[PDB]
Design a protein around this ligand. Structure first.
Ligand SMILES: *C(=O)/C=C/c1ccc(O)c(Br)c1
Length: 126
């Protein structure tokens, strides 16, 4: 009932290109797909369990402006938009999520998706 994909795997963008919503919900880690502006295209069940948000409700919201203002910073949004601009986004770092929630530290892996104007944000607890 799970997709046997590890967080941080070198070819994660190839493995996840085949997955619809149900398959994304089979991952062990949170998975968000953003467009280049930060609008949420996809959001899986594991991420909803980490953050408390409803994966169906967040689609179409802007990550940086709307749902995740704590990521509107050089250390998160800044890294994202630099990787969008280069066309080779691939950066991993720890971060704390603290907006209208118990502060929760995560490991974040942002990586360009194979789909046009699409960027993954992968998430697990630390
Ligand atoms: C800080 O504001 C973090 C907010 C947050 C992190 C992760 C997800 O998935 C959401 Br919808 C919000």
């Amino acid at each position: 009932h799970m997709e046997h994909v590890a967080f941080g795997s070198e070819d994660i963008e190839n493995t996840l290109a085949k997955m619809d919503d149900g398959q994304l919900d089979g991952l062990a880690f949170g998975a968000i797909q953003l467009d280049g502006d930060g609008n949420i295209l996809q959001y899986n069940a594991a991420e909803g369990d980490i953050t408390g948000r409803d994966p169906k409700q967040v689609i179409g919201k802007n990550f940086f402006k709307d749902v995740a203002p704590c990521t509107d910073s050089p250390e998160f949004y800044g890294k994202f938009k630099e990787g969008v601009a280069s066309g080779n986004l691939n950066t991993m770092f720890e971060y704390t999520f603290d907006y209208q929630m118990t502060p929760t530290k995560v490991k974040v892996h942002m990586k360009k998706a194979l789909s046009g104007d699409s960027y993954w944000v992968f998430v697990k607890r630390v």
